[PDB]
Amino acid sequence: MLSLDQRIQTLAYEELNKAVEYHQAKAGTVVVLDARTGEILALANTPGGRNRAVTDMIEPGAAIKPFVIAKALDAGKTDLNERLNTQPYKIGPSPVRDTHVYPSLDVRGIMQKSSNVGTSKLSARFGAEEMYDFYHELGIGVRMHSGFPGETAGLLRNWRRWRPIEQATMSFGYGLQLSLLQLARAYTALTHDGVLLPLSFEKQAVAPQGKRIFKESTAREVRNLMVSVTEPGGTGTAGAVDGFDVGAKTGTARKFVYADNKAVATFIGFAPAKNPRVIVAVTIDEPTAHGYYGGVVAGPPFKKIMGGSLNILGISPTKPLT
C-alpha cells in the first residue's frame, strides 16, 4: 500500500542509532529512495521526537556541490577536460578556501577532493538570478507537502539580495537551507538521468512524470565523477560498498555562532553508480566522539544501509566481492 520497505527502514533505523550512539551525536536522520521512481523506502529519525527528515532545515554544505558542477557542465560553461585554478582567494574581506591548497583541478578533482574554490568559480560563471532559479527548480525553498505538521519550505533568499560572496558560499552549501528529504529528492535529478522526481509515500507502478533539469548525458557523466569520492583519494571512501560502484558526496556543514567544531556530518550517495537503483542519505547532527567529518561519521552507516538495501532489493553486484 505505502512505499515504505520495512526491511530497509529497520536496517536504517538500527544503523543510525548505532552511529549516533557511538559518536554521541545530538540527532540523526536517514532517507532511502528508489533512484528511478522517487518512492520513499525508509525514513528514520533519532531521537525521533519529530520527523527531522522533513521538518529540520539545514545548510547542506558540500552535499550541494554536484548540482553546481552538473549545472556548469549542462550549460557548457565548463567541461571534463578543463583544469581550474583552485588557489584560495578572497572576495573583498571574505576568503574562499579549501582544506588543502590544490594548484589546479578538473571537475572530477573538485568532486573528489570537495573543492569550495573550484565549485564557487563554476557558480560565478552564472548570474545571480540564473543560480537562484536553478536552486528553486531543484526544489530549494519549495515545500514537499508530505503531510507532516511542522514541515519547512527551506530558505532560498531573493537573488536581488545576493552579494558576490554569498553566491559563492551557496555554491558549496552555506546561505541556503533545505531538509534532508529535499536534499535526497534533488539527487534523483542525478540518478534518473537528468529528471527530477517529485517523491511519493505510496507504491508507484511506474515512475511518475518528473521535470527535466539536466541533459541525460550530463547526469550520467556527473554520476561517474561522483564514484571518485568513494574510491581511494576521495573524501568518502568510508562509504564504499563491496561489489558496487558508489557515487556519493560527503559534507561537514558548520553551524551558527560559523563554529569550527559544531557540525552536521552528511553522507549521501547512490548505487549502482552507472545504473542507480537506490539513494541513501545520512546526516549525523553534532557528533562529539570518534570523529567530526561526514566521511568518517556518516560514511559507515551509509555503507551498511546501501549494501543491505541493494542486497534486499536483489541488485546484482557489478564487481567481484572481496
Curated annotation (Swiss-Prot):
It is a single-pass membrane protein. It catalyses: Preferential cleavage: (Ac)2-L-Lys-D-Ala-|-D-Ala. Also transpeptidation of peptidyl-alanyl moieties that are N-acyl substituents of D-alanine. Keywords: Antibiotic resistance, Carboxypeptidase, Cell cycle, Cell division, Cell inner membrane, Cell membrane, Cell shape, Cell wall biogenesis/degradation, Hydrolase, Membrane, Peptidoglycan synthesis, Protease, Septation, Transmembrane, Transmembrane helix. The active site is at A62. Pathway: Cell wall biogenesis; peptidoglycan biosynthesis. It is an enzyme of class 3 (hydrolase). It comes from the Bacteria. One of its GO terms (biological process) is cell wall organization. It is found in: Cell inner membrane. This protein was sequenced in penicillin-sensitive strains LM306, and FA19, and in penicillin-resistant strains CDC84-060384, CDC84-060418 and CDC77-124615. The sequence shown is that of strain LM306. This is Probable peptidoglycan D,D-transpeptidase PenA. It comes from Neisseria gonorrhoeae.
